[PDB]
Amino acid sequence: SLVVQEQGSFQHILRLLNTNVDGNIKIVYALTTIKGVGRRYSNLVCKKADVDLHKRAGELTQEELERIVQIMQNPTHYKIPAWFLNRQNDITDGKDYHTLANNVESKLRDDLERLKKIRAHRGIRHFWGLRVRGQHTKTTGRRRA
């Protein structure tokens, strides 16, 4: 029966990992604002922060706030299994990561330089703007832009 009043404690427009998330979305979904977090990740990183999912971002006061930020930056240290993570077995280090908000496009652009530089097929196509997963081109990917 959470009719309750929630006076100006309700933190509007919060910002996080060099991003902004609107306080009016339910927490688990309000988080997905951030490149790197999906609905399935933002479900359980919020489970391990004792977050009342029933609530949303203007609520969930600043201690639970950095109580989730840290589970996110070290997911492997909060009972989050490795498969759940986006970057595993890195290829230069060999740990298990989750590249995150500004760092996703960085280490993706790194992954493309990575094999453009080694001049291998996948990379060549990435450089040509062509399509790299073996699909047909005769018909599809029209209006190239």
């Binding site: 001049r119 060549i124 450089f127 040509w128 703007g129 062509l130 190239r144």
Partner: peptide
């Protein structure tokens, strides 16, 4: 090899879209 292609400029995609399409590609019914 691949380096012969990758940095072979003039062969990507706006080097295609630059040129119009040969107007004999909508023309049939012999």
């Amino acid at each position: 090899g691949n380096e012969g292609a990758i940095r072979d400029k003039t062969a990507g995609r706006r080097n295609n879209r630059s040129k119009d399409v040969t107007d004999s590609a909508t023309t049939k019914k012999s």
